[PDB]
Ligand binder design. Sequence first.
Ligand code: HEM
Length: 199
Amino acid sequence: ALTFAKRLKADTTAVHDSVDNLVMSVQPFVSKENYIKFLKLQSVFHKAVDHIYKDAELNKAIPELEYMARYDAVTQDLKDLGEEPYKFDKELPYEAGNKAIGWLYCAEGSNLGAAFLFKHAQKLDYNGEHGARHLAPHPDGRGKHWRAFVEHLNALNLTPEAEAEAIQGAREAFAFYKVVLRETFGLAADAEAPEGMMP
Ligand code: HEM
C-alpha cells in the first residue's frame, strides 16, 4: 500500500470483515425489535465520534467535516421508531489525536458500506426519509463523497509514526463497535460470527 487511505483499509480489512459478519449474524433486520437494537448500537458508535467530526483542528484540514456527522440522523431514526434518544451504560470513548483520526476513518468509511444495510433497511419500510436516515447515501453519492474524503486523509501528511497511531486507532474503533454490539444484542464478551463465515 503506497497511500495512507489504502494502508488503513489493508490493516483493518480482517477486523472489518469480522464486524460485517457479526452484525449480519445478529439479524438486525429480522424484526422491528432487533432493528431497534441495531439503531441503539449505531447511536452509541456515532455519539462516540461526534466530538471528532466537530474537532476544530480537524475541520481545518478537512472542510465541512463537522457536517458529516450521522449522530442526529440516528437519533431521528430512533424517534421515527417510537424510541427516545439512547444513551450508553458505560463511559463513552472520547478519543483524540492521531488515534482519533483512525476513528474518523472507521465512521466515515462505514457510510461507504451502508449501502447494503440501506437496501435491507428498505425491506422493512425504512428509507432515508424514515427509520434509515443514517444509512441513506450522501447527496453527492457515496462514491464521490468518499474518494474526496480520502484525498483529505492522505492530505493530513501523517508520518509513519502518526499513521501507526491512526491505524491502531481504527482497529480500536472497530473493536469498540463489537463491544457495544455484543452488549446491545445480549452476547457474551468476545462473541463473534460463526467461524468461517464470509462477508
Ligand atoms: C454488515 C454491515 C456492513 C456491511 C455489509 C459492510 C460492507 C462494506 C462494503 C461492501 C464496503 C464497500 C465500500 C466500497 O468499496 O465502495 C464497506 C466499506 C467500509 N466499511 Fe463496512 N460494512 C458493514 C458495516 C460497517 C461498520 C459498522 C463499520 C464500522 C463501525 C464499517 C466500516 C467500513 C469502512 C471504514 C469502510 C471503508 C473501506 C475503505 O477504506 O474503502 N462497515 N463496508
